[PDB]
Structure formats: structure tokens, C-alpha cells
Symmetry: none
Subunit: 160 residues, 2 copies
């Protein structure tokens, strides 16, 4: 089936909320209590906050069958460096080369500078594998206090 990657608009807020919520509930199921996940999702992925985020910094969406199935948020950090601030696919659309397209095409659309950094929860083996497969390399590792919970995080960069 054909897919398209495109710049996001404010209208995409509900779809982005859904992708993030579905992905969180699936990936964090053994890593973070549900009530904490939902608190974060309600705080950062409510529609109002998403309008502000989408307006402030570049989001790309992956769409297929007229449905947004993935999204990426790129943020410029300082001269010549950027952060992959958010990157999610629905679990149903993984392992099909689409994450690679979202990343590479999103970076083109927004002329994203390299190095680009990403924080990844150390427990998300699927995400760790993906970033390593795309050529990301570890720079730092630390434990985040996330709602009072330890979240072990690996920070990677991509520079080619």
C-alpha cells in the first residue's frame, strides 16, 4: 500500500494524540504504571498542548490509507544540532520500513541539522534496535526522575 509523509498541521492533533497514546500503552506496559502514562499523555498530548507544540516546532506525519499512523517532532537545539523530540509509530505499522521513511523524509522536509540527538528508554528494546539499525550511536546514559519513578535512558546521536 502507498504511504505519504507530510508536514503536520494543527488539525492532526487528535491523530497524533491517538498514535502517542496507543504507542505509550503498548511499549511502557511493564516499564511505567498506567496511571503515570496517562497523566503524561493528558499533560503533553492533549489537543490544546499539541496545537501549541505543532505551531512551535516541526512535526511530520506518516499517513497510509488516509490515516495518520506515525509522527516525528524535530527540534533545533543550537547552531548545527537538533533533537528527535518525539518519534512514534502505531505498533501495527512497525517492521515495514516506514519508520525509516518517516525519519529520513521528515529530516529532508525540515532541513534538519546533524547531529541529531534522541533519548530512548533503555527498556524499549524495539526502539533501541531501530535507532542502532539506523546508525545512531550512544552518547550518554542516565536515570530520569519521571513522576518519582526511575526511567533509565540512553541518549544517542545520528551524524550522517
Amino acid at each position: 500500500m502507498d504511504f505519504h509523509i507530510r508536514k503536520a498541521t494543527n488539525s492532526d492533533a487528535e491523530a497524533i494524540q491517538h498514535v502517542a497514546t496507543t504507542s505509550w500503552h503498548h511499549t511502557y506496559q511493564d516499564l511505567i504504571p498506567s496511571d503515570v502514562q496517562d497523566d503524561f499523555l493528558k499533560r503533553f498530548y492533549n489537543v490544546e498542548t499539541l496545537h501549541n507544540r505543532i505551531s512551535a516546532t516541526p512535526f511530520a506525519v506518516l499517513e497510509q490509507a488516509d490515516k495518520v499512523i506515525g509522527f516525528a517532532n524535530f527540534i533545533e537545539l543550537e547552531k548545527g544540532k537538533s533533537e528527535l523530540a518525539a518519534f512514534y509509530l502505531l505498533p501495527e505499522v512497525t517492521q515495514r520500513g516506514l519508520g525509516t521513511e518517516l525519519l529520513e523524509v521528515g529530516m529532508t522536509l525540515f532541513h534538519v541539522p546533524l547531529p541529531m540527538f534522541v533519548n530512548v528508554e533503555k527498556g524499549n528494546e524495539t526502539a533501541i534496535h531501530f535507532y542502532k539499525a539506523k546508525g545512531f550511536v550512544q552518547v550518554e546514559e542516565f536515570t530520569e526522575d519521571f513522576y518519582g519513578y526511575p526511567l533509565e535512558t540512553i541518549r544517542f546521536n545520528l551524524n550522517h
Copy 2:
């Protein structure tokens, strides 16, 4: 008066943030806590490596003027759509100029920080207390912190407008 910027912290800012925290601590806690004890806290939470991690993982804003970081704020999540101002420091030299108001308000914008936001303040820090009350913060709790065996009378405030 001069131009100033409020912006997100970067890893490079770690040394300057350490300096602001250290200068502010030594000034405001001078009659309360010995400096060697203050310095142990600063070593634990404001060493450069820990700051790199905190800057990567959590909302950190800096106030910059004449090319120097002169203040910073760190905002952390609480449950139920609440926030905490986990750190809010200005150099003693840049207080009373309207700059803390900007750091707080613009810092909140940059990171989409929701109200209510809570902050803990030492009871005898008349300057900080006046600042929070002036911005419309309201006391909601009172407690004594054990700080390396020293009592620190603390007032907890929040802002919700």
C-alpha cells in the same frame, strides 16, 4: 537597562548554571548552613555531569545577559496536571530588575508548563518570599526539612493563574 534573552538551556550551559546555583546558595544560606555542607549538596546536584543529564531530560530555561547566564529555572512534572518549580535561581546582582518574572513566564511558555505550579522556599528568604507573593503565589503547606542534620523551615506555595 540592557537586552537579555530567555532560552532553553543547552549542555554547554552546565558550568554557568553551576556558578549561578553556587553563588546564590552561598549568599542566601550564609547564616543558616555552613558552606562545606552547602557545597556537598551543590556537588551532588549541580556537578557538570548531573547537569548535562538534567538538561537533557527535563525542562531547563536560562536567563542570559551581556553574554552570561545569570539565572535559570528547572520545571518538573507532578501528578494530575501540576508542576513544580524544582530550581529557580538568579545571581544576587540581577535581582529586582524584572528579570525573574521574564524567566518564569517565558520559561513556562517554552516548555508548555501547566498550572498549578508549586515551589518550596526557605522561610527566612524574604527576597524570594516577596517575589513569589508579588507574582500571586499562595502558601499551601509548611514543613521543616532536615538538611544534613540542620533544620530548614520551608514554605510551599503554588500559583494557579
